Design an enzyme around this catalytic site. Structure first.
Site, PDB file in Angstrom:
ATOM      1  N   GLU A   1       0.797  -1.222   0.000  1.00  0.00           N
ATOM      2  CA  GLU A   1       0.000   0.000   0.000  1.00  0.00           C
ATOM      3  C   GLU A   1       0.832   1.275   0.000  1.00  0.00           C
ATOM      4  OE1 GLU A   1      -2.547  -0.155   3.427  1.00  0.00           O
ATOM      5  OE2 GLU A   1      -3.512  -2.017   2.815  1.00  0.00           O
TER       6      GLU A   1
ATOM      7  N   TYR B   1     -10.549  -5.909   6.472  1.00  0.00           N
ATOM      8  CA  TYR B   1      -9.646  -4.770   6.497  1.00  0.00           C
ATOM      9  C   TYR B   1      -8.758  -4.526   5.283  1.00  0.00           C
ATOM     10  CZ  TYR B   1      -6.314  -1.639   8.998  1.00  0.00           C
ATOM     11  OH  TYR B   1      -5.520  -0.637   9.496  1.00  0.00           O
TER      12      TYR B   1
HETATM   13 ZN   LIG Z   1      -1.650  -0.042   5.293  1.00  0.00          ZN
END
Ligand SMILES: [Zn+2]
Ligand SMILES: [Cl-]
Ligand SMILES: [Zn+2]
Length: 193
Positions: free
Chosen positions: A82, A153
């Site tokens: 990410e 998540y």
């Molecule tokens: Zn992250």
């Protein structure tokens, strides 16, 4: 469900801010690697930062191979790369099998040392807590999560936050690089909760 430990690795790439003292070979490597989306992916490649992804994949593989040395098996994993607000980072979920919580600190410390040698030419990354085991709370025990943590998540992330993902879990193989599949699994997770 299957249990996992989570180690977040902040990805070093800036020769001034992260890797002072590194040789030209690092920039040459990360600059020359071309990435292509698999046929089954629906991601927008223009939003993927290739130089950082190049470092990230090498970190992921070196991390997993070293982990396998300790677990003595091809441990199951789900790794998501990410682009955070401050750092590019990897959420590294690896199954707990064969790794006791009390020894995890030493193992991860050894993995970090291996990353420094293999990926960073012996140069220590100048990033605070760049290899961190997720804890239940500060000073607490190493957090253990089950498979549900993935659709709850990690799967919801969209581009550009979501950069790439890898897994050897059959249930999530398609979801790794497919937003439509992630959408399906996220929906299913909500329905079941
Ligand atoms: Zn992250
Ligand atoms: Cl961040
Ligand atoms: Zn296993």
């Amino acid at each position: 469900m299957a249990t996992f430990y989570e180690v977040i690795v902040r990805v070093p790439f800036d020769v001034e801010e992260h890797l002072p003292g590194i040789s030209d070979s690092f920039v040459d490597w990360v600059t020359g690697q071309i990435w292509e989306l698999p046929p089954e992916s629906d991601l927008n490649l223009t939003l993927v930062e290739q130089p950082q992804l190049t470092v990230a994949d090498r970190i992921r593989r070196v991390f997993l191979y070293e982990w396998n040395k300790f677990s003595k098996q091809e441990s199951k994993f789900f790794v998501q790369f990410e682009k955070g607000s401050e750092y590019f980072h990897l959420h590294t979920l690896v199954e707990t099998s064969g790794i006791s919580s009390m020894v995890l600190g030493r193992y991860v410390s050894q993995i970090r040392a291996q990353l420094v040698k293999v990926v960073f030419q012996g140069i220590e990354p100048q990033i605070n807590d760049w290899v961190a085991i997720t804890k239940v709370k500060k000073g607490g025990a190493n957090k253990v999560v089950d498979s549900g943590y993935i659709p709850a998540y990690l799967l919801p992330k969209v581009q550009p936050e979501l950069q790439w993902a890898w897994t050897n879990l059959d249930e999530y193989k398609l979801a790794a690089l497919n937003l439509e599949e992630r959408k399906r699994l996220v929906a299913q997770f909500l329905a079941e909760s």
